[PDB]
Symmetry: C3
Subunit: 439 residues, 3 copies
């Protein structure tokens, strides 16, 4: 388990986000599963400090996901700080210290909300470097392709090798420096006082990269995804095209699985072992069993059994539950319906609010009109209209082109189709030409 | 407004295009909306010179889009020059001067047709540099990863830092040099005469890049698209994957919109504000209202209302007009049909040549056979066959599995479905086994 | 024709593949059409040596595709070597020499099975370099962004410019060095003996790149595909997005064809001239005629005629045979069925195990239930159920919503649909409100 000593972490999410050009606040923008605020707060919760406070601008819209949805899921209390007037980064940290007690002793960690790739390891290295030299200020730094340097390689100040914006302060030195505006000046005053100033270098520049516009958001969204796709490949996932395959956080994929280009695994998608995920597939919070094929499928909040063939051209809606060895073929839509083990729903069908038994069959061009219940080993005919509610017994049959409105007994044929009538030489009388010649 | 002084621009599109390996001429190849000829002529029309002439090889196929479709849209007359025999670039410019009067005074700008990324700003900088030093010849140059240089950094000649192929001549010097073969020799003779030769450097190398093969066409097609996608992101468009998102010229996207990977916005596509464009979506000349969702849709020449849900698995055909809050669900095809405000067409449907009123409903597995008119607040049943023409009154109903051939009165049920008949113990007699046990 | 002198090639595919994290052996992993073993053995068969032997670890699963499927297709006998205990690369080559006669005279070529991009040209250059200097050992080398060097630029030894792992030995020197463990030591002993050691440099580093994990497999899968897509573009294929377009080996594309992003041409796909391949299209072993449009199609083992419109939203299954000018529209599924010349199957249809004549028409929302035969110039109505077997004569008709069970005579109407019945003011009595007001 990874954890620091006595530390307090301040999150700075008080920026207006004018460069984003959005009505929805900058820090609440989602990438690869979670929002930018969620990415920062999760990394700090991994190490778990003594205090965690977030500074906010327009707070009321941001105070809903924070504390309510974030702190309750993580399992620890997070405080909220309010900035009165946007003056600078130094004033924002001062507003974060107001929630902290006046007689606090532990270290202060300064972090930004618009840094989604910042993980626990980078934050743990900052605190470890801070304790080693016993410095008043420890700053994370990285190299690019704005840290000022003298002549004999020493740290001085920052002039928008580069400054990341992530800091580690001693509260005894931070309170004294802010009393005498930007946060970059705090380091300059501490240097003038003769305090130890240290710079910890991060080799991976993408971790401490900030987001100002939607270009930089997509630059890091493609970056964060690249690490996840590669991590599954090393674990045992055959990804054909990593550039088009999108995998969010918490998404788990099984051993020896093939994922084809254009696939988006979103939310909390679970994939079993030896699965063939086809091209152009979108899944969100969908559980997939072992050996199941998911080709060309648009799924959301669904469950697929072991060795089940889903697709192509399948649309799944919240509440879909396909069993083992069950088949969902082409042009099939399922909404809030439970499908049994070995049941095949192949051609041009819609199953809405229904329960189907084991090893049954649904006829082509059949729809469930809106609870309907179908038994086991039931072969329903093609173009079968289901007017809810209908209870079908086990082992029953249905004719081709049958409108079912009432209950069907176990082992009984349901028919309403009109018998075929042929009129010879009708084309020769009705049609003057075209398909009439020759007959 | 941007405009030069007294200038005449010559476009060189007389190349055979053997490297392209195409029956269709090189310069007529389209990328990101417009053709290569259209990209060049639009950039020159932005600044608008006194004269514009295009030199052509096989003219008759190229003279149709030029003058007829190009000059009429821009609003200014363009002349056509014909090359008798492909001798070189110097002879091609001489053929361009033949359309110009013998007593012309203004400057001559030389440009190539196979340079699609060449914009107005690069051409405006060339003329401004040409007027400043009062040079006889001004040439655009760029750096690569074939300009000849002496020893004290001076311009001499060109030996297939690099030559772009875009020139600015003084007509008094151009007419005199061509009288005494390639266009690169003209600069060499002017240098020997003692005339001022100037080179204007372009920092962006992609702007003056030429196309010889279909590889270079795709290299610049991915380049031109990269700038457009990024421009929308800075404006206020959340693009998930810029590499798979294709946006043509004239295509406008609204504020705070989400576009998912695999989306192609082609032609003159318009997107409103706060729209959710789903994965694998193709739209060409389709107008989309504010807050509308377009997921997994193949659209061409259509209109989508405000807050309307289109998709997934929807195919739109020229003449489709969906109103506000209207829903086009899964596996739906619409051809030349007007759909009212709040009308839902959800499952496995085809609406061809029909007019539907406000807040109506279309049953699942129903098709419009080929003008049909549906009223407002009309709930048509599932598997409803529409034999054109049918006029349905406001507030009417239709049964499940009904073939409608005649007009339906306002507030009237249309039924032709056969009633359900159940035969008990049919499976036990007809089938020897399988679903018979147990019943 | 390219061919070496007297040479024997040993393939080393005895690695366990623990880094792959797969139940299926490393060398049997497929990329861009063929497996890694198939890619190596095809390149050696192009030049065709006197002897070819493959060393294996767990042989019984790998001995099935090898010799049986590989040697029979190429047309020459390949031997199988078995490794008793994984000791090293030097022991693996010694196990390869056991299949060779004790009095063999020709050269020995050492190659790895996990090198898919290794072509015939790289192997031909190795043997040509080996014969020129008459060296005992000739090794292929490349530059990266582990060959040991002295001071005056000479070859010594290898310390996991770089070592590729591909060798060329003289059998008189190879047998003597292995008698006195890794294969890298063999070069070191030969250098100590005073034998000539030569290094042939390969400018293209991707050719001799090895695969250990699924990341490197995808790194070379995207690399190999990039060369193929570019090769078609130079030949005469307009590819919009090369990054998303996947083209396997043996796949041939015609002249002046347009391929849209998200297309996967797999197996032995054939494309005619002037074809428009739409976005999100997957084809495997599918033949496409000249001028045919394949948009948004999931095809496998099918045939498309000249100038035939397939798509969008079409799913093709093994046995599909569409003729010339035939149309397969939106939401159509075809399984093991022959479709005639000029036959249109447009909306929401399934054609399973059927034969349709020339210039016929299939109604919307119609399915073929399971051999069915349809004649020429036959216009079947919408929602037509086909209960196999049904023989339809030439020029026959079918009503809208007709269940066909028996044979239809040439030029005869088939009807089973119930006539429309209208009940006026039904909504006013049955429904208390909603669509009732106003009527």
């Amino acid at each position: 388990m990874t954890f620091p000593g006595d530390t307090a972490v301040l999150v700075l999410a008080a920026g207006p986000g004018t460069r984003m050009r959005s009505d929805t606040p900058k820090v609440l923008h989602t990438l690869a599963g979670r929002s930018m605020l969620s990415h920062v707060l999760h990394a700090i919760a991994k190490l778990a400090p003594q205090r965690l406070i977030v500074v906010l601008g327009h707070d009321h819209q941001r105070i809903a996901p924070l504390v309510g949805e974030l702190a309750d899921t993580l399992g620890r209390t997070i405080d909220v700080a309010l900035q009165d007037r946007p003056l600078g980064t130094g004033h924002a940290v001062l507003c974060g210290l107001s929630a902290l007690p006046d007689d606090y002793a532990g270290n202060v960690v300064v972090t930004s909300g618009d840094t989604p790739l910042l993980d626990a390891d980078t934050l743990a290295d900052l605190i470890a470097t801070h304790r080693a030299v016993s410095a008043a200020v420890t700053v994370l730094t990285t190299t690019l392709d704005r840290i000022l340097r003298t002549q004999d390689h020493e740290v001085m100040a920052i002039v928008q090798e580069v400054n990341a914006g992530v800091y580690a302060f001693d509260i005894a030195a931070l309170r004294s420096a802010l009393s005498r505006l930007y946060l970059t000046d705090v380091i300059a005053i501490l240097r003038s006082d003769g305090q130890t100033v240290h710079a910890s270098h991060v080799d991976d520049s993408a971790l401490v990269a900030g987001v100002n516009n939607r270009v930089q958001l997509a630059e890091l969204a493609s970056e964060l995804n690249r690490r996840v796709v590669a991590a599954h490949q090393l674990a045992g996932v055959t990804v054909v095209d990593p550039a088009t395959t999108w995998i969010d956080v918490d998404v788990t994929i099984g051993r020896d699985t093939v994922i084809h280009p254009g696939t988006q695994l979103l939310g909390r998608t679970q994939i079993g072992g030896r699965c063939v995920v086809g091209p152009d597939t979108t899944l969100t919070d969908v559980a997939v069993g072992d050996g199941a094929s998911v080709v060309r499928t648009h799924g959301s909040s669904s469950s697929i059994g072991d060795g089940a063939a889903v697709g192509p051209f399948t649309y799944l809606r919240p509440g879909t539950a396909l069993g083992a060895d069950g088949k969902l073929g082409a042009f099939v839509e399922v909404k809030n319906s439970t499908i049994g083990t070995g049941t095949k729903v192949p051609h041009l069908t819609y199953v809405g609010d229904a329960d189907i038994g084991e090893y049954s069959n649904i006829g082509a061009s059949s729809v469930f009109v809106n609870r309907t219940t179908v038994g086991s080993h039931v072969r329903t005919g093609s173009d079968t209209m289901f007017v809810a509610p209908v209870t079908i017994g086990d082992g029953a049959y249905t004719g081709a082109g049958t409108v079912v409105r009432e209950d069907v007994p176990p082992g009984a044929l349901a028919v309403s189709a009109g018998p075929q009538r042929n009129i010879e030489n009708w084309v020769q009388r009705k049609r003057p030409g075209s398909p009439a010649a020759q007959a």
